[PDB]
Design a protein around this nucleic acid. Structure first.
Lengths: 120, 257, 204
RNA sequence: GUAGAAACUGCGAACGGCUCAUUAAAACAGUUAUAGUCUACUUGACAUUUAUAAGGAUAACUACGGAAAAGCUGUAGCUAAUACUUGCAUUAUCCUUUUGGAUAAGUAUUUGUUAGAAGGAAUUAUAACAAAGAAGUAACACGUAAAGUGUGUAUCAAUCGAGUUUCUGACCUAUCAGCUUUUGAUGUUAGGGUAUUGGCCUAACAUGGCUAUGACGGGUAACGGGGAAUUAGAGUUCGAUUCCGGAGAGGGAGCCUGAGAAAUAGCUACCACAUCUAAGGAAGGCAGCAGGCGCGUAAAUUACCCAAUUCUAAAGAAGAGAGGUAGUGACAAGAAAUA
C-alpha cells in the first residue's frame, strides 16, 4: 500500500536529545495502516538507521478514514530511550516486560504489615 | 489544623498561567522564593506549556534534575520556583538565554536574548534599610538584598545589577523621561515614558504615563518598573514592542495574511 | 513464679521457675532497686545477694519505680517515662501499671546478683559473654586499647576480613575542609574590606 | 566499593477529602490598617562575650517471660550518628600624615539618659553612654572546574500565609419598648497575659453605652459569596453542593508535640452508643472512599490504576479510596435510526 506522510511542528529538543513533530498519514480509500510502514518511511526520510529509537502514539483514524493524526518522537539511542522513557511506554514500544502486576495490593499488604510486629 | 495550604486548584490558578480546565483539578503551587505567586510563574508551566519542551510532570522533573537550567547563571532545582517579573534564565548546552518580559495583553512570555544583554539585568528596588555601622542595604523586587548602594539612589529609583559580581552599575530615576513598564496594573503590558505624577496625601500615588501613540493612562506608583531613560529601552522588548495596539484595530491587523 | 537472675559482670542471665510461696517471704514488702539475700530461693543460692529491678504482675502489667503501691494503678505516661513506648512525638497515653511493692501477684521477677556468695551456679557465674561488638568511636577504642594518638587504630580493629567504620577519625579530608572554610572566611573578610573601601570613596 | 532487613535521626502527617449542625453586624463580600503582630521550607545579604578534633546515652540485637490481646511490655550487656552535650583566634577606631604606635571589642532582647536616610505621622533605621542578655558564627556528610555540593545556624527583607482590624452591605417579626450595668456593662489609670493592640483579665476610679433610623428579644425547614432560573425594563425566587472564605469530625471541655492543631484515621475526662473477654482488663469514632443498617418520594460499585494533575519525603524508580479510569445511571444536555 502507498500513502502520503506529513510532518508538522518539526522542532528539536536538546533537553531530551529528541525531536517533536506532529505526524499525519494520508491513506485515502484505505483503512488503518500498520505502524511498521510509516516507521520505515520516517526512518528513510530522516536517514535513521535504527527502528527502536522512535515512539509513535496519538493515532486517531478520524471519521471516514483517509487521514490519521498522530505524534511521533525520536531518541538519540536506546540509552536515551531507557533514561527518558517510562515503563508503560517501553512495554508498548516493545523493549522490556512490565514489573510485577500486583498494583495496589503492595500498599494493602504494606498496611497489613505493622511496625515492630515482624522480625524481618 | 488551619496551616498553610499546600495545594492549588486548577480553576484558582492565576489567569496568565493559562491552564486547561479539563487537565485535572490541581495547579502547581509555586514554592516560596524571590517573588510572589501571583506575579511569578513556575518553571513547570514555563517549560511545559510555554516552551512546549516537555509534556508531563515526570519528564519536566527529569529535565530539571540536570544542571542545564540556570536562572541568573545560578542552577535551580526547585521544580515550582518563582522566576519573577524580570530575570535572566539560561540553557547551557543549547546556549540560549530567555528574559521574562510582559505581553501587551498582559501575560508572561520568554524573550530571546543574547549573552551580552543577558549579562545586563535590571531590578526595581523596593526599599532601603539602615543597618549597624550606618550602612544602607536596598531590597529589589527580586527579593535580592544588595548592600552598599549609591547614596544618590532613591527608593523608587532602579539600579543596574551585574549577575556575576552582584554589584550596582548605574541608577535610573523617576523623571518625566523615565521609560517604565506597568507591572500589575489594569494597563499591564504597555511601555511608556510617564507624563506626570500626583502626590496624594497618604494614599496610592498615581502617575499618568504617555505612550508612543500619545495615549495617556493613569496607574498606581506601587506597580511600575523603570526600564531605562528616554534614550532607549535598556531591555530588548518583545515583538509587540510594548505598544498597546487597540482592540478594535487589532482585528484589521489580524485579518490580512 | 519465675525469676531472671542476671550477672552484669558475666553478661548472662538464668531463669528459675518455682511454685512454693515460702521461698518469697524475704522479698515481700521490698521495693524495686533494693538488695535482698536470696538464700531461700535455693540451697546453692545461700550467700548470694540479689537486687530486685523488674517484674510483671499476673496479667502482665509491669512494675514502676516511682509508684510505691501494692496494686495495679492508672496514670498518665510522659514521653521520657520508663514504661511507655512512643507512638507520636509528644503522644501521652494512660495505661494500667503495677506498683513497685512486691506481693503475691507477680508472674515474673528480674534480679541481678550483686555480691558473690559461696557456691557456683552452672552457666551463671562461670562463663561470660563479651560486648558482642567493639566500640565505634576512635576515641573510645583508643582509650580501650591505651595507644593514645601514636597511630591510627584502623589496624587494630576486631575482625570476625571486614571491620566496622570508625567515627571521629583523622582523615585528611577533615583537615582539607577545615582549611577550605578557613580560607573561605578569610576571603569573606578581604572582600568585605574591599567593599567598604570602595564604598568609602563614592560617598562624596 | 555496590548495596542493604530492623532501628535511631529528619520532614510531612495542621495538606487533601467530606458535610452544612451551629451561625442575624456574627460569618461572608467589597474596602483598610497591622506606625499593634507571628510566620515551616525557599531565595537574597551575612556573625557577637585535645584542635593533625572533646565527652556520655541508647535503639535494633543477644538471653527469660507474663497474659487472650493491644501499634502492650522488665531487667543484664553493648555500640554509633547531621539524636544530646562542652569547646580551639581576630577585627575595627585615633595621631605624626604607603607606613609605626595607641584605643576598644554582646547579635537579637530588656531597662534608664541623649542625638536622630525613609515615610504621612517615629519614641523609625541608626548612633552615643550606663546595666543586664539568650541563640550561633560548622568537633557534620558527598565530590564539580579539561575552588564544588548537601545538611545545620545568629539577624534582616521578600516569598508561602495566618491572627487581629477601619469603613459598607442581611430574611421575617412590636401579639418583642426600652435593653446592658453586683456576675465588665461604658470608659480612665495601673498591672498581668498574649506574638502583638484590646475589659482579654485583674484592682481602683467615673456612670456610663445602645435604642421607633426598630435596640434588646424571638423565628428561619438561614453557612455566606461571587452565582442559578425567570427575565423588555423594573423586579421575584433559589444558592448544601465544581472554586473562595467560615464551621465540624457523636456532644461539650482540656492538653502535649509541633513554625503551623484547642488536630480528633493525636491524646485526656464526662455524657450517649458500641467491640473482645478465660469475668482480670483492653480497645472506638466512615459529616474520607466503597459498602450495610436506620430515615425517607428519593439517590451508584464493598471495582482497577498512580498512566494523566498535584502533594509528601531522606525528592526519578516509593506512596496518595487525593485524583484518574471503569461499573450502575430516560438527573439533566448535544447529535442522530425506524428509510
Amino acid at each position: 500500500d502507498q500513502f502520503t506522510i506529513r510532518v508538522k511542528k518539526y522542532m528539536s529538543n536538546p533537553l531530551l536529545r529528541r525531536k517533536q513533530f506532529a505526524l499525519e498519514i494520508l491513506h485515502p480509500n484505505k483503512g488503518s495502516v500498520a505502524k511498521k510502514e510509516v516507521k520505515e518511511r520516517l526512518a528513510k526520510m530522516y536517514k535513521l538507521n535504527n527502528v527502536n529509537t522512535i515512539v509513535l502514539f496519538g493515532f486517531k483514524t478520524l471519521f471516514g478514514g483517509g487521514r490519521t493524526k498522530g505524534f511521533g518522537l525520536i531518541y538519540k539511542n536506546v540509552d536515551a530511550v531507557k533514561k527518558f522513557e517510562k515503563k508503560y511506554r517501553l512495554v508498548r514500544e516493545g523493549l522490556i516486560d512490565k514489573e510485577t502486576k500486583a498494583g495496589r495490593r503492595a500498599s494493602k499488604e504494606l498496611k497489613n504489615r505493622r511496625k515492630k510486629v515482624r522480625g524481618t | 489544623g488551619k496551616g498553610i495550604k499546600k495545594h492549588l486548584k486548577r480553576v484558582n490558578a492565576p489567569s496568565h498561567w493559562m491552564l486547561n480546565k479539563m487537565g485535572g483539578q490541581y495547579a502547581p503551587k509555586t514554592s516560596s522564593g524571590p517573588h510572589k505567586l501571583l506575579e511569578s510563574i513556575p518553571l513547570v508551566i514555563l517549560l511545559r506549556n510555554r516552551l512546549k519542551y516537555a509534556l508531563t510532570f515526570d519528564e519536566v522533573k527529569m529535565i530539571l534534575i540536570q544542571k542545564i537550567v540556570k536562572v541568573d547563571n545560578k542552577v535551580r532545582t526547585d521544580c515550582t520556583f518563582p522566576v519573577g517579573l524580570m530575570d535572566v534564565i539560561h540553557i547551557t548546552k543549547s546556549n540560549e538565554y530567555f528574559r521574562l518580559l510582559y505581553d501587551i495583553k498582559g501575560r508572561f512570555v520568554p524573550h530571546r536574548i543574547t549573552n551580552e544583554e543577558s549579562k545586563y539585568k535590571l531590578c526595581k528596588v523596593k526599599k532601603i534599610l539602615l543597618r549597624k555601622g550606618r550602612l544602607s542595604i536596598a531590597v529589589t523586587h527580586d527579593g535580592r538584598s544588595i548592600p552598599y548602594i549609591h547614596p544618590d539612589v532613591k527608593v523608587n529609583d532602579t539600579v543596574r545589577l551585574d549577575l556575576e559580581t552582584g554589584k550596582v552599575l548605574e541608577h535610573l530615576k523617576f523623571q518625566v523621561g523615565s521609560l517604565v513598564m506597568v507591572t500589575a496594573g489594569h494597563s499591564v503590558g504597555r511601555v511608556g515614558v510617564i507624563s506626570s505624577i500626583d502626590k496624594n496625601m497618604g494614599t496610592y500615588d498615581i502617575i499618568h504615563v504617555k505612550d508612543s501613540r500619545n495615549k495617556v493612562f493613569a496607574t498606581r506608583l506601587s506597580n511600575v518598573f523603570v526600564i531605562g531613560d528616554n534614550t532607549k529601552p535598556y531591555i530588548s522588548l518583545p515583538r509587540e514592542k510594548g505598544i498597546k495596539l487597540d482592540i478594535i484595530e487589532e482585528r484589521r491587523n489580524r485579518l490580512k495574511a | 513464679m519465675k525469676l531472671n537472675i542476671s550477672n552484669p559482670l558475666n553478661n548472662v542471665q538464668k531463669s528459675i521457675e518455682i511454685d512454693d510461696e515460702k521461698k518469697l517471704l524475704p522479698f515481700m514488702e521490698k521495693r524495686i532497686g533494693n538488695a535482698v539475700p536470696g538464700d531461700s530461693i535455693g540451697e546453692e543460692f545461700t550467700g548470694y545477694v540479689f537486687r530486685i529491678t523488674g517484674g510483671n504482675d499476673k496479667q502482665g502489667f509491669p512494675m514502676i519505680q516511682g509508684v510505691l503501691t501494692n496494686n495495679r494503678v492508672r496514670l498518665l505516661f510522659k514521653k521520657g517515662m520508663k514504661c511507655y513506648r512512643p507512638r507520636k512525638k509528644g503522644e501521652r497515653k494512660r495505661k494500667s501499671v503495677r506498683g513497685c511493692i512486691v506481693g503475691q501477684d507477680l508472674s515474673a521477677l528480674n534480679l541481678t546478683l550483686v555480691k558473690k556468695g559461696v557456691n557456683e551456679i552452672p552457666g551463671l557465674t562461670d562463663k561470660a559473654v563479651g560486648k558482642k561488638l567493639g566500640p565505634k568511636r576512635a576515641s573510645k577504642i583508643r582509650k580501650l586499647f591505651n595507644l593514645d594518638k601514636s597511630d591510627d587504630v584502623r589496624k587494630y580493629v576486631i575482625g570476625r576480613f571486614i571491620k566496622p567504620k570508625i567515627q571521629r577519625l583523622v582523615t585528611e579530608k577533615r583537615l582539607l575542609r577545615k582549611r577550605n572554610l578557613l580560607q573561605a572566611k578569610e576571603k569573606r573578610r578581604l572582600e568585605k574590606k574591599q567593599q567598604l573601601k570602595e564604598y568609602k570613596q563614592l560617598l562624596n
